Scaffold this active site. Structure first.
Site, short mmCIF file in Angstrom:
data_model
loop_
_atom_site.label_atom_id
_atom_site.label_comp_id
_atom_site.label_asym_id
_atom_site.label_seq_id
_atom_site.Cartn_x
_atom_site.Cartn_y
_atom_site.Cartn_z
N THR A 164 0.80 -1.15 0.11
CA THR A 164 -0.11 0.17 -0.14
C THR A 164 0.91 1.35 0.20
OG1 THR A 164 -0.33 -0.07 2.33
CG2 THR A 164 -1.93 -1.10 1.24
N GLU A 222 4.20 6.75 7.59
CA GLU A 222 4.64 5.43 7.13
C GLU A 222 4.82 5.35 5.42
OE1 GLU A 222 2.81 1.54 8.66
OE2 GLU A 222 1.84 1.65 6.62
#
Ligand SMILES: [Hg+2]
Ligand SMILES: [Hg+2]
Ligand SMILES: [Hg+2]
Length: 264
Positions: A164, A222
């Site tokens: 992702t 992230e």
């Protein structure tokens, strides 16, 4: 400068016997991937003690997250860098709500209510983690290196097209589908003080660039962490032993230890 190890008795490493045959234990840039079975802890403890290593452990605990500090710190006392010097740094909006946890000798805690050079003079390594977690097994000097990331537990078996990453070319965090080594989780990374400050400096500048351009990366810090570690390869990678969620993911055979885990 680095003194000699003492005489030590341990099993001979066998050149023609792999440690683990079920997992990749070294990246293609020759960085160890840290799994149980890959390291002799007695050897590593000696090397790090002889250098009088100090490890800083940083956590941010704001609003409701202060509730997680008691279990976090108590379990770190049992499992994190036991035998070495540890400095905990708790960044919090509620200084008075920080639980009074009994620490082992050589270990200390600073509470900072919410300057970078403090770290350079105080510790050798910085380990940056999420507070809503507990230690369940050994997390020790095997992780220490100039720069490390940790494999996200949901993606270690995934192909890169499934990672992702930020996929919009408009974002500083952008990674295309034919790029990527691993998917690193933002909840556990670290390295030398200088390397960690470089990483967090890079991710703060990239995030501002994105803000200015009216974009927010899909997985925030992230996403930027993943961009940074793509372009600046970590010198060790930690297996998902070091960031697990047994409730979501069970206990697969490939994990011999569950060391640092989501809280039930
Ligand atoms: Hg940090
Ligand atoms: Hg950031
Ligand atoms: Hg980052």
């Amino acid at each position: 400068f680095m003194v000699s190890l003492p005489r030590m008795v341990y099993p001979q490493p066998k050149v023609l016997t792999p440690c683990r045959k079920d997992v990749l234990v070294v990246t293609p840039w020759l960085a160890p991937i840290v799994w149980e079975g890959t390291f002799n802890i007695d050897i590593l403890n000696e090397q790090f003690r002889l250098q009088n290593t100090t490890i800083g452990l940083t956590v941010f605990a704001i609003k409701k997250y202060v509730a997680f500090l008691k279990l976090f710190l108590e379990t770190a006392e049992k499992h994190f860098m036991v035998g070495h010097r540890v400095h905990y740094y708790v960044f919090t909006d509620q200084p008075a709500a920080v639980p009074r946890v009994t620490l082992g000798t050589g270990r200390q805690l600073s509470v900072l209510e919410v300057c970078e050079r403090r770290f350079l003079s105080e510790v050798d390594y910085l380990v940056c983690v999420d507070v809503d977690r507990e230690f369940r097994d050994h997390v020790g000097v095997e992780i220490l290196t100039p720069l490390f990331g940790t494999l996200h537990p949901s993606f270690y078996g995934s192909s890169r097209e499934a990672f992702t990453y930020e996929r919009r070319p408009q974002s500083q965090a952008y990674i295309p589908k034919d790029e990527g080594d691993f998917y690193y989780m933002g909840a556990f990374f670290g390295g030398s003080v200088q390397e960690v400050q470089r990483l967090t400096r890079a991710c703060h500048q990239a995030m501002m660039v994105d803000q200015a351009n009216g974009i927010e990366a899909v997985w925030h810090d992230e996403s930027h962490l993943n961009k940074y570690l793509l372009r600046h390869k970590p010198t060790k990678v930690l297996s998902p032993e070091y960031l697990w969620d047994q409730q979501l993911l069970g206990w697969p055979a490939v994990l011999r230890k569950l060391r640092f885990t989501a809280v039930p």
